[PDB]
Write a protein that binds this ligand. Structure first.
Ligand code: VDM
Ligand code: VDM
Ligand code: CA
Ligand code: CA
Ligand code: MG
Ligand code: MG
Lengths: 548, 548
């Protein structure tokens, strides 16, 4: 099969991971020094947030040059050396392709706002790069994404005298993708990095490329064709690279981003519909939500794989849940209004689970045992908390915490001088939550996370198995099998805080023994009617095999 | 009933708990300022390690003045104030009475050593306070406890000219209890503290009082009878106080230290025979050692109550298990030679369990659910580690870890100036492990423990119930009931690192509905012949009730 199908992914931000020269910013040499770490954890492919020159208004998703390295993070040599030293270790690396928009400080915009007519009278070929309107009345009936900041998806440019369009911050003018010169500048931006050896892109904000009037301007088939043309160029020019979509849309609409067998689009997408069901089901001791939204997912192509995640650099998004669902989410996971942002909760994973490692472990095992390829957000694998005194979503992006030295060992500059303050609260601060500690601690979240990844590696059904939900008698208990190449897994997991009892329907499996995936320990043989009786301690996970 | 039967005991050392005067040593002023900690923890009775004047060759168990407060710890007034504030919050306090032996520096033995005849030719009355020998040949066939230090239980005195006897350190000469003056001196020491309001006494080395030729000089009748008389005086003169006995022997002999109902000895003794079976049976993943040793223990008198304990200030003793059992514990729990001292392992509860909170929690609940009154060891409730760079058994008597301020909050002194050094390693040090942090962490081991005690509070069957073991068919799984005043509690614990199944023998309970003590989640009604199927995750504890 495909390398992205069997790979464990790991999301990190170069500016925040490790600083080698001591200027308080994470740099590519620093990150290179830490690849030994990531490889021993069980990681297969690093995914790097945008590393491109940028004013960092949206932390570098406001790209100001797709073809250089941001000075903060070192040089192109620094980048080149990093990607080598990662490939010599068997890590794949992918980047972030900011395709929907560019910064207002891009040299494209800085020209487009001059007017459709240059001084001499010629047409300014760059004004057509971004979308403009004279009154700003167009594409209404359209949803605003960063409502806490932005009143209007249009903004007036004091020098272009028109309104430009932006699905996110005012400083990120949307790119006119009706202009086939823009599909080529983008095809070029991707080519430049694939030419350097890069193993793929996560493509950011794909639903929002094209905007048609009388529609929502999300998931337009005009948009999907542009993507198709991208996978076209990647499939022809650079075989085997990985295109990963971030599509947070309803079950049906998201699978459209895989394209079809005939007409490929993305290799994997983020399973954004399950992640909130994971959380909201944990507080309800009801696994029904998980099972519903999973049924609603249409089969994806052969080449496609899902990408399971718990958290990321962004808020816990809550805009593809029902109105009762999102209100529940706020009441169980956002007690402080400071924790709300743009329809979502902006908290790290451990703080979301009240630092309960029984819970942190349980969600992480679901994340491994669901069909897809898991992605761990950096720091979560050692239990990092957040800092909601920081603006926007930066609260979950504080510096990695390697030890209890100066600035958690992320930099030799004082914590006041690191790009984001290294957490030092008495519960999640780096005096308590740091990699050094957890490699000496025989039973740390870090040793646990790595050992679990080792277990999953030992069972390809986790990567390539099918998914069959097994009835239990108990909504707090979520059971499913995974079959692939003869081996059948049975993943039973308690989503409740105290002992739960359950009656599993292993009727298909009468005669077979469940044995633990670790310890090689057999339970009783499935017998008679196959109603398998089971008790579960709080927040437990049973990883089992069914032999023959 | 009597108060000790419902008490939660908490063992601490005044020299190492809280320094209230900057000098690097804990003191009674300091300890007094932390009593609201203990009250709020759910602690009933404080057992204070020896507070008496001492050269501290054996941490103060080598007493030099049974009637003072060691200057390191403050003054008799500071003691009376502590004892008044402790009682004010409903805490009981018991001291440590060191009957078997005094310090070399004690006035008595300093007088004894002058010889039988004083320079004026009259008898020296203080010579017979201690046991002397002209050649050291007597009481052969005796064992040495401090095997790593003392090569014989006789030591020649350079002045006295003869050999004096000592079951422990040669700077701890044994007192001579065939001398009636000595038995009175002991009662006078007891009266002095009972009179101050002390609620009772843990008694040291009770089995080693009387030595007789041809015997082990252990558990001798002549000893027990001196112990009956001690109880006799306390029941007559100071009704209600507590005599608690440190009798680490085999099950038959341990229970003799309660006396009979006609002839009472101690109110409670430590359950030494069960302690090492728990650790052993966690490693072996087989709990038949527990059921076995626990079952060789005879019924004990009405007034009698066991004191269950996981660790203490001493080493984990292995002088009371088989040679084979003792080798397994070394290979299981002492990989570095440094961890062995004197037929035992000198490690803290968390290191012993490789800092796994699941296994800490399992053994903690089995301490709270076995029949007896449980005693905690200070710091084991936050996960404090050990410091085996310290001589003897001081590596587990490091300062309390209060905050991550100076020296763990134990002292405003620098750590290099405190009596034992506050632990600072990456895993167990006070930047990661301390009380203030665990008060703000929602799921800290400190809170976990408070709650588990608070939960045991609501179910007297723990404190007072009988104990009925229930067969399981999986030696991994331990199962037993507690029955008291109608409530039938079913406790089932998994001592294996993976999922385990079992067939509990709930025949005596058919028609009863097991629900969980916490939240009352129900498990199937016991039907049929009462062979209840159960499954368990690793290190799982089900605390259930069965109604009617
Ligand atoms: O509505 C779906 C989402 C996409 C958005 N995520 C991308 C949008 C932006 C591209 O400029 C960027 O701020 C964000 O980091 C990207 O991951 C949004 O900010 C999230 O809150 C949300 O989960
Ligand atoms: O075998 C029983 C024991 C009794 C002994 N405990 C008392 C002996 C000493 C009395 O002076 C003292 O060192 C120890 O703290 C007391 O609790 C011994 O030191 C222990 O290691 C051992 O477990
Ligand atoms: Ca657009
Ligand atoms: Ca003696
Ligand atoms: Mg830098
Ligand atoms: Mg002091």
């Amino acid at each position: 099969p495909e390398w992205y199908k069997s790979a464990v992914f790991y999301e990190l931000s170069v500016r925040t991971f490790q600083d080698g020269n001591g200027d308080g910013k994470g740099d590519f040499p620093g990150l290179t020094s830490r690849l030994d770490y990531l490889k021993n954890l069980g990681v297969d492919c690093l995914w790097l947030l945008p590393w491109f020159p940028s004013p960092l208004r949206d932390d570098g998703y406001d790209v100001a040059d797709y073809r250089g390295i941001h000075p903060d993070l070192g040089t192109l040599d620094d980048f080149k050396v990093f990607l080598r030293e990662a490939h010599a270790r068997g890590l794949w690396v992918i980047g972030d392709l900011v395709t929907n928009h560019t910064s207002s400080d891009h040299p494209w915009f800085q020209a487009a706002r001059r007017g459709p007519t240059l001084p001499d009278g010629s047409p300014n070929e760059y004004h057509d790069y971004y979308v403009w309107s004279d009154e700003g009345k167009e594409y209404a009936d359209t949803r605003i994404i960063f409502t806490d900041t932005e009143v209007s998806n249009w903004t007036l440019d004091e020098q272009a005298g028109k309104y430009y369009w932006h699905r996110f911050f005012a400083s990120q003018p949307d790119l006119n993708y009706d202009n086939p010169k823009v599909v080529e500048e983008l095809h070029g931006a991707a080519r430049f990095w694939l030419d350097l050896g890069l193993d793929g892109f996560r493509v950011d904000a794909v639903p929002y490329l094209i905007e048609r009037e009388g529609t929502s301007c999300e998931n337009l088939p005009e948009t999907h064709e542009i993507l198709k043309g991208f996978r076209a160029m990647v499939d022809r020019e650079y075989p085997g690279r990985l295109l990963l979509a971030e599509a947070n849309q309803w079950p049906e609409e998201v699978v459209e981003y895989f394209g079809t067998e005939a007409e490929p689009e993305f290799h994997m997408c983020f399973n954004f519909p399950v992640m909130p069901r994971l959380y909201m089901s944990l507080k309800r001791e009801d696994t029904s939500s998980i099972r519903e939204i999973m049924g609603r997912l249409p089969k994806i192509p052969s080449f496609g794989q899902w990408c399971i995640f718990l958290r990321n650099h962004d808020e816990l998004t809550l805009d593809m849940v029902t109105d009762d669902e999102r209100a529940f989410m706020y009441a169980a996971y956002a007690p402080d209004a400071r924790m709300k942002i743009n329809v979502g909760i902006r908290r790290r994973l451990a703080p979301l689970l009240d630092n309960d490692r029984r819970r942190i472990e349980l969600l992480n095992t679901v994340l491994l045992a669901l069909p897809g390829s898991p992605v761990l957000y950096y720091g979560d694998e050692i239990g990092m908390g957040d800092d909601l005194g920081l603006p926007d979503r930066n609260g979950v992006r504080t510096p990695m915490q390697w030890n209890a030295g100066t600035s958690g060992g992320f930099s030799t500059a004082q914590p006041s001088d690191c790009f984001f303050p290294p957490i030092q609260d008495p519960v999640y601060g780096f005096g308590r939550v740091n990699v050094q500690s957890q490699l000496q601690d025989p039973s740390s979240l870090l040793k646990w996370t790595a050992r679990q990844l080792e277990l999953r590696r030992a069972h390809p059904a986790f990567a390539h198995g099918d998914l069959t939900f097994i009835e239990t008698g108990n909504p707090a208990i979520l059971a499913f099998t995974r079959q692939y190449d003869g081996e059948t897994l049975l993943i039973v997991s308690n989503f409740a805080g105290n002992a739960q009892a359950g009656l599993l329907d292993l009727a298909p499996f009468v005669g077979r023994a469940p044995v633990t995936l670790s310890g090689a320990s057999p339970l009783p043989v499935v017998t008679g009617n196959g109603q398998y009786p089971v008790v579960m301690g709080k927040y437990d996970y049973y990883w089992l095999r069914l032999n023959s």
